[PDB]
Amino acid sequence: NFVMPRQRAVTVERERQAGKQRDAYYVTQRVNLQRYFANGVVSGTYAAS
Amino acid sequence: NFVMPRQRAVTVERERQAGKQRDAYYVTQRVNLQRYFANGVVSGTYAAS
């Protein structure tokens, strides 16, 4: 348990035409952390009032 | 009469750098339908309450 399924790597695209005097850098990433079943975890917590 | 005048048959364009992560497809055609003289057609009409 605790796998991080990954659709793709990080990518970079760039755009400057038909812009106005300006290179633009765009980056994207699709990643998520999602566990299977609810077992084997704690917080703690650890609290005041 | 009822000639089909045209100056641009169908053009299919394509952009992807960058659109902000979104391709764009553009389709255009330049055409018209026009008659030399005001005669040669009737419409019914076929109308009542």
Curated annotation (Swiss-Prot), chains A, B:
Name recorded for this polypeptide: Major capsid protein
Role summary: Major capsid protein that self-associates to form 120 hexamers and 11 pentamers, building the T=13 icosahedral capsid which about 860 Angstroms in diameter. Responsible for its self-assembly into a procapsid. The phage does not need to encode a separate scaffolfing protein because its capsid protein contains the delta domain that carries that function. The capsid gains its final stability through the reorganization of the subunits that takes place upon expansion. DNA encapsidation through the portal triggers capsid expansion and the binding of the decoration protein to the capsid exterior.
Portion of the full-length sequence here: 410 to 458 of 458
Organism, scientific name: Escherichia phage T5 (Enterobacteria phage T5)
Subunit record text: Interacts with the decoration protein; each hexon binds a single copy of the decoration protein. Interacts with the portal protein.
Superkingdom of origin: Viruses
Disulfide bonds: none
Cellular compartment(s): Virion
